[model samples]
Target: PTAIEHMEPPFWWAGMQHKGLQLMVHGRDIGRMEAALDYPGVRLVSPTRVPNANYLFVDLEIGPEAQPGSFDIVFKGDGRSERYRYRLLAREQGSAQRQGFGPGDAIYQIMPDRFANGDPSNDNVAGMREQADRRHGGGRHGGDIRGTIDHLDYIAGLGFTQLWPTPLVENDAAAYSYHGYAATDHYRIDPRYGSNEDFVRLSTEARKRGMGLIQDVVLSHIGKHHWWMKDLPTPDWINYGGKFVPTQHHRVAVQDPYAAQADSENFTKGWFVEGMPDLNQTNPLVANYLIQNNIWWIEYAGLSGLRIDTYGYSDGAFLTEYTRRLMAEYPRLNMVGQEWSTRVPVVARWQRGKANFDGYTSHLPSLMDFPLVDAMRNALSKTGEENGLNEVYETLSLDYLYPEPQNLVLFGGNHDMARMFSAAGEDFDRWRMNLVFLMTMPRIPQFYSGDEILMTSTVKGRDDASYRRDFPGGWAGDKANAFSGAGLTSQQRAAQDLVRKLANWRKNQPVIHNGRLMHFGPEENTWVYFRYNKDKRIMVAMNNNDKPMTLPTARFQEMLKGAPSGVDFLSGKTVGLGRELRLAPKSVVVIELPGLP
Candidate 1:
């Protein structure tokens, strides 16, 4: 008959704990054909052939008595023959025990073309080539996925359990394609950002509100208008030989122990932005098409983690077998890579337990801390207490070079920086002392979709289309509507009610999730810390002084002995534990310490 323009993971999931599966296919000379399938326990084992006869990869095994069916690969040779039909579903009750987005959740990074525009009818999508231009600040202003599923309830009323929406797959670029990090299609989704069951109904309505989608993957470049850049199934898939050079973005020459193996091959074979492309993941069919399009979008968008985008510009042994085959098929998901160095041993060698002197091994668990966002933007606009407000306490004293430093992710501004309310110059109490040290830090806190109402941008010619802006009630003749406070600006409704009251009181804080942190090194203009465990004990305390300060409380009398009275948590009230501790200049103070002796 006819039907094989492509087949990458056309379908899979008959008990997949990685029993292996490939597929790929394509059309035209259709790689001179010859594949065979049938059904029951599925097998087709070999079909490779890449030199671009129009592709074909095949190879499938999937054992464990593969059930759920529908099969008919049967391609057959030159005498002409074809039939495709592959499907093999079933796997959802605890899809491999899903459970990622950790440090008890809080992410929220959405930039789906500046978060919101529900559907001005797929804003011009006829053979896509960039269209929606609301006053072109880098075009495409028709935000989609039905306007982030019409604001997942203003992102779960701001308590943000985790949502990270940067790359919604198909970025058919033509002009600054709406920041989806140029992908051009990895199993489609960008029909102007809606389709593929509208991203499995935005990961099934953001997991019914408790949230968890992540995605944003990108395996180091692809959009030079990819359809595998018009036939490329191998011949070292795409690095330099595929053209356009650039990329001395020398990521500390990948762990630089006296680098220069051509400076770590021009930092992982260059080309990180000339309309993208550089992908040759040491080829093996481009690392099995980016490890089966990242496990076919985490088993077709039921994901709960993966942020990777330009994560250490690929080829570190194919990112350790693409994060060890997605933790060998979802061992509690959660990924987080992006190594945009600010150094702490260059973002702690690549997380997943740093030990690389050159023995390079990283299964990547998380990392995007970027030296605690350059020490919380030099502890919010430098002034001092060690280089100003003790740069988030000398950058979390190098968290003993992270192994799982609370599975890093921490942030204050993202969408490519310069706007955590303009890193405090746009005041609002020095942006609530850097959003209360990123929601009482330790790690895993993210939060960047118009950083709660204050969304500014340029710290100096910044502009990533100006901090990926535009979320004021996501469009509808918007006159300000950070989701409802229409025509807002009573300080953007108190910076959207202090990010919905510290993200719904730090998502039921397990003493700030997985507790334990404890600090006390930068006094005056203050800093404090302390997340404790054993049921609870919080105590934040920032005070970036613009005036008030009382400080000394017997130097935290042995970690403030059994709290006498404490609950403030941004004014719920009840203070007491004293000997001196009154502060409120730029202010922070989260409290809640009842006892911890």
Candidate 2:
């Protein structure tokens, strides 16, 4: 079903950063062979034979003028001769300088296995360990790459410019492997999710619909069933000698000034779970392999950016090098790492230009704003003067902590936890406020799939499979079709309607895109924020009271200036900006000032 005994990056692009390419060839007794090749502008530097009798590392260099075509590499040893043809595909137009997603773009994140099921035939792939089981067993569902492709238009229609799906690579673990974090084959996509050709098609089709793809990468560990686990190419390739010592889960150790050495070591070296083997990044070969594999995938798929999973768990030095090298190749690209902490400084440490007291430097550009997630959730679900809206005001006030605070991705909920609606106690008004804040905040905004229709989970972070439940109407015979607004509850319809209205409007507002954020709030159970520029002004007002009341406009005089009336961006109603404005219970409105003059 595949070519060659085994080869990494099956193919690569030429005219890249002029870096050396390391090819890992795996086959029985292949390490004993002498490697040789002849091609113009392509040099065979050297080959190293490891302790394992089944692997050979080829150090090869492809010059800038190297032709994008195929060449044969002949191997001879142990009384046998073999040939492997390698490929150097030509680079796409403007591929080197592709701009990454930023404030101007809104991202929609989807778990492919839970988003939709476009191809049921691949649900139970032959030789794969798991099969589709939709109801309560926590087993694999029928969703795959095609599911996302089929829904790209739906995503773009929701005013999203970028799409990020969790890892799509192979995960062959017998239990709970659908998450994609535990990767059995780094270079191959699981048969259940179509194939590598399908990924390229997804990328192309997405761009054709004016959307870009962001890949989720996990560098900390690999599935226990990974081929490397069986062969043990080098004794030091895996951390803790390939044992299943669990991490302390003490993330603070990574940045704590006086933390114990053992704490830091265990945090980095320990396996995330028994079935996920940690990679020893300190090993030179392993580091090179990981870095090259990253380059190959990014270039191969034409990705817009990356979302790093479990960021702080990997080796800090190796991470510095990884980000440094990756950025060196893709200068303007953005890669946001997930640092799951409520502490600002800890998450801040991974951003590009933070000056840490411990003298550690990071080359990573952005990180997930977990602290903001907490504040957003708490502010919506709680009450009182110093609690509800105050959490949001206080969190944004500490923007000095991050060098590029705007690069931080602000999200109410993601795949690992409860949905935004569930986190907001199922209060429709509170949920609307969160969505309004997500689009108007001074950072990159990302929302998970099913957010438009108010998805929920019985367990918050306790049962991931439940949170990543399959999408309604993704398959035939479902009661509801989110794509075509059929059989939806009143709340679901309203939620989706609000999402569509605000998100679509956010896409066209440059003020919301690049303007600085100014928020005045926690007063009279109301909060008002303004997004403005030299030419136009946009206002976001939220009233969290349980009863209808009038919100005084005097406090916002500075932002409003002399504007007397404005058009509601959502409803397009031109309401006079008098001394006060009438509001409904727990309502929020986004208005464009001066009413389209």
Candidate 3:
């Protein structure tokens, strides 16, 4: 029998808390498969079948004092013995040491062409349609990776620890395909955004400035105007062919056992939007190429994380395989999928740590908190005594569905929706309360660009291009600028300062990142929570009442849990646990535990 395909060290070596390594090997015969990982300290985890061949998954526990390094992986088959590949790997003392990613990071999402135009020379290139007379907000305005690199300090100063750029891959499509969702070539970066080396440089510089870079990847679809749109690799290369079939939009249908057949078909087989075309990941050649593209980006850009777009739209099994390949390489890395499912069980099923009823598994580590995002918006909106804040509290009860409760990527707004400030109807207090809650919430927090300054889309535009307006100073010769605080309203300035202060404060608070949270306030219109770690503790209270309210000393004191007296972090003031603290009308307070000195 011939030597079969094999993967070594399993995936998620660096981040997983478990101390075992998994190896997946496939071969025609049982003897050949068993010979693949005959090394010391290796044991089989599970045996499975892939396509037509049988696969053996082995788990190896590294004994104490064993160091991680590159090793020659040899596959010995009955026909002959040959070293198939060399794998470079690492082993950590413990899972905590291996898990380098945490909630401490604050991600800044940027659009390359709309972010900054450092070099105008490559703005409009040959073969690319130019939209000089087209509308400003909907078209590319010459923001490139070089421009992002040029303004790293601005991002760093805004208290963001990570940068998430939209798809920077080559999009040689016509019309408003400036968004990088469609890929003409998986291996190349679009010349309009800059070169492959420029992407590497952007990540390198971000790392130098204590920030990590996450690439936005689209595995579900490619641009319909892509170079391959006309050429044929195979008829089954794209999902549902070149035809534009709308998605069912029934994401919750997964739980509806009696869901209509049409709903199931439409939900599973639909285009994300009109312009983009979905890729058929079930195709072997397409799957292999997509998997290779993932690894290529990690190595090429030296990426710290991946923000996989449209997760559930692809073939579920193929998505699992792709994630396994990625996690196997950099176990310490971070990657999140945009499942967009509100049901906790449905979302949890796709994460790496969850168990499925079908006995299937996925290697995906993190997932965007779409359910919580929806709940948060509802919780912070203006409402009656029993409606608003209860939404968030009830949402927290569903945290049990996640493998790790702390791993969720929590955010108030993203590029896809209307800005939070605008959504809140220009209400500063509600906006600040939401921000405070996000910064002090249980999961990791991320902010959309222009969210800090209360930038709002006055006219509703469902298209993402309309939502992702260019940053003020990102383009050259633009009149108004966000970077320099020009062309911003008084409310916008206040909102920007509030975000900057709260975000910078969060950056230094270890308790907020890795702390134990205790919450109080059964009141529908009021809420309070505290973050406590070894060195410090913080108390946050939000009262949405139109008039000021006072919390009883005993109830507020119990939430402190013997922290003694504390000062309000947002305001410098002496305080005692026994005192009845007056909460300002529509106010949020950050109280620092007293007696720390």
Candidate 4:
């Protein structure tokens, strides 16, 4: 009745592994028509009707012989006919074989809206619900893709090889829309962030600097103002029939043996928030739509990996299928899920190789190491022989629970948590110790934006806006600029240099990435560990004691048998490894041992 207004997955590429494709057509009473396609190497399956007369689900299969070209689909009904042309393009060379980010790369997370503002013209886009306002903490601040492009060199220079910006899709919310979590348009990039082409250029520019892009995806929900909200394809497209039902957040229910059916239903089907409606992945059409959308972005942007947000909140069956299809298409691609539980058991249950009591399976490659982060925070904030450094040593011993511990992402602090410096009691020594553990541990390391410059969030008790403050020199006319090192204090500059040195050294250290890990129990408020392989050996020692401690070398006879001396990477001081090793007050020493015959 209103001439086809929208089509999802607007276009597709040939030579895809998945032959079957579903196109969602939306218009006024367009579902009341008959659909037909007459093209070689392509056959149209029957058109499926939904509860609403404004939407139709058209299924089609493209054979291996299908060539890249345009085709027309004819719809006839009510003594009228409409023809829509769709195009299929050739896949990029080596697209399906693209490598995703792994332990070899360090990821840098940035909140694009708070990073930098390169263009001032698109601050307030016409017809958008929200406008840019730097004074408001949570308001849109006009940071865009071009801003990220301008700072690519700065990010790459920090020894970070992977860049993860939050969702860049269109979030046409009235307020708090700058975060880009609640996406209103699936097929369109936000006008405030520039066009889809701008995102492609960002990716291209990042590659030139040896950095890969990781997209942050939200698969559990969509903004209430999403296009489908106006005319849902079916009554069951959204959970609770578009009603607001807050989730119980009992993430363990999916693995609980005695969990009630209703409890599991509420956990998976309940809404995330009043403005974010939970999607019903149990609906086959909805499942297909989401899966295709994920692949579409990967191919469109040439992404290296994905950081899935709220990963476990969706239906378990749908998640399994979703991951399965994705892995099947791109065997080498890596995907990490966000499971924020503080218990290692709870978080490990969602990992790929975990052995669960309920026989639940997941294809996810990695999970956020929240348990380790919690333990690190508690250990560094205190000072005692019993609790100061022992917490970290004990938490790391639980690595047997993970199938791929090396793939787990370890971080000092992220966008969701308090600043690392504040969490460490604002002590530079403690922060340095934290960085040492993060870089040397057998896991993928991630650093939040502004962490290198010791950015602080002084608010007590989880002030998100305070933690996500804009960088010092991201805007014009700022007195201090972190990028240019113009107005930094001695401590801030030292912190930045320390991170750069360690990160760049870590880039070439194979022992830290693929070597065996051995650690001794803490004693005298000190901890010792060694990461070694045949090619190299690195010994890391941390002293949480208030005064300098002399560690007897006899305790580590097994690891220091023939090496008479070693060099400290941090201080460039060489110390005799014969009788004992001395360390400064509340400091860390990283020693590179000389190879023996």
| Models sorted by TM-score, best on top | 4, 2, 3, 1
Tell me, what's the RMSD of every candidate? 20.5, 2.1, 8.0, 1.6
* Deviation from truth (RMSD, Å), model 1: 20.5
Ranking by lDDT: 4, 2, 1, 3
Predicted candidate 1 versus true structure: per-residue lDDT over 507-576, tens digit per residue: 8887777878878887655877778876678877877768777776778766677466677778788766
> Which candidate ranks first by lDDT, i.e. highest?
4
Clashes of 2: 0
For model 4, what is the alpha-carbon lDDT of residue 401?
Answer: 87
Q: Model 4 clash pairs?
A: none
| TM-score, every prediction | 0.36, 0.96, 0.80, 0.97
Clash count, one per candidate: 3, 0, 9, 0
lDDT string, candidate 3, 59-168, tens digits? 45544333444344454446656454433245323422223345888888877776788887787887776542225665667778888998998888888888888898
Q: Which stretch of 10 consecutive residues in model 3 shows the poorest summed lDDT?
A: 8-17
Candidate 2 overall lDDT versus native: 0.85
Any residue pairs clashing in model 1, and if so which? Answer: 118-147, 144-147, 384-388
- Alpha-carbon local distance difference test for all models: 0.80, 0.85, 0.71, 0.86
- Which residue pairs clash in candidate 2? none
Best of the two (3, 4) by TM-score: 4
